[PDB]
Design a protein around this ligand. Structure first.
Ligand SMILES: [Ca+2]
Length: 142
């Protein structure tokens, strides 16, 4: 059971709030199925959704990703939340992609005993070079 809605782009951009960035669900970006997510070159771009994480629970976050040509910087896949501690610590669980062939990355993390902010998944492309980024099969599972 994937906590991310439509992590495969098989339902287009459905389940993903429009943040106004150049993110499309298109055949050229597919790792599998009929579509993948394409984050346009030339601009920073991201999308995300709130994720219903449980406390003291272990999760695996994974995704396939590639740039179409060598980028200036990177694109991150992140699950993030604040702790409910005195310092109000911000936790980012991050996969950082810079590669130009399809590359699978994953991170295993265990959630704290309480959240200080609503957990979110975020895909964020810092890079604004000419290369497009393709993301597909984005997965967050207990
Ligand atoms: Ca797909």
């Amino acid at each position: 059971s994937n906590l991310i809605v439509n992590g495969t782009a098989e339902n287009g951009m459905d389940g993903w709030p429009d943040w106004g960035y150049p993110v499309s669900a298109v055949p050229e970006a597919a790792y599998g199925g009929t579509k993948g997510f394409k984050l346009s070159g030339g601009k920073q771009a991201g999308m995300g959704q709130k994720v219903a994480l449980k406390p003291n629970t272990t999760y695996i976050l994974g995704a396939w990703g590639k740039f179409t040509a060598k980028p200036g910087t990177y694109c991150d896949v992140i699950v993030q939340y604040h702790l409910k501690d005195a310092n109000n610590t911000y936790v980012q669980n991050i996969l950082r992609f810079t590669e130009t062939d399809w590359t699978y990355k994953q991170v295993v993390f265990t959630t704290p005993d309480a959240f200080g902010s609503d957990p979110e998944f975020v895909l964020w492309k810092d890079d604004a070079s000419n290369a497009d980024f393709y993301a597909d099969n984005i997965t967050l599972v207990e």
